[PDB]
Amino acid sequence: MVSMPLYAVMYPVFNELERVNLSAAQTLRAAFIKAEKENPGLTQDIIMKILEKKSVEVNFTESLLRMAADDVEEYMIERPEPEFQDLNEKARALKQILSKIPDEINDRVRFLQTIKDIASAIKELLDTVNNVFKLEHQKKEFVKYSKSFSDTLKTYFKDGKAINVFVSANRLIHQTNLILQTFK
């Protein structure tokens, strides 16, 4: 894996740069991969600093969450077995729902619905993983970050700080992608 900001934000940019010049684009991609590999968290700093220098005013992690529902091709499963097709569908659903959080969190009714939707999606994703099994480390990690998201919700309903919910949602998306990659 690479860091979430890298594959979710920078990777699609690199792909679009390929039609301009493949060599230079590959250079950019490899360079960013190496820089993030050496010092994790750096890609986020770069992106935020560039957004700052261009006076784009939006919260980084919120926007990250907004754009985080798309497939990462190099991680995705394209297998004819029912279990893996189900895996892809459930994972996709979870990522989409989690991505809808910034749009729904300022309306308490909607958000209260979103929580139920998320619980459902997580339940189904777990079901699907179990169906695949018939490894457990990645399942345990996923359960841990699901639980972490739940606890984060518990804290949110107390202090009202949505940014933490955005963070937890992002981490759960990353873990979903990790499930995808590990089962690949």
Partner: protein, 67 residues
């Protein structure tokens, strides 16, 4: 030709260099981080030499993702 104007207007000189300088200023004593940053800028420069304007496009698409 318009050599100086082109590179002066490119996001390499306009955005990348200062941004990276500041990124170093965030942790000026972190050697490996600063070296990663330097190598990264060097590679971005290689890419720009290979295809003028590509840094402009990288930046523009980048912010187009965040709007």
């Amino acid at each position: 030709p318009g050599s100086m104007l082109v590179q002066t207007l490119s996001c390499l000189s306009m955005i990348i260099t200062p941004a990276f300088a500041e990124l170093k200023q965030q942790d000026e004593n972190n050697a490996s981080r600063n070296q990663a940053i330097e190598e990264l800028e060097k590679s971005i420069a290689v890419a720009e030499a290979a295809c003028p304007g590509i840094t402009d496009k990288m930046v523009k698409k980048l912010i187009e993702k965040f709007q």
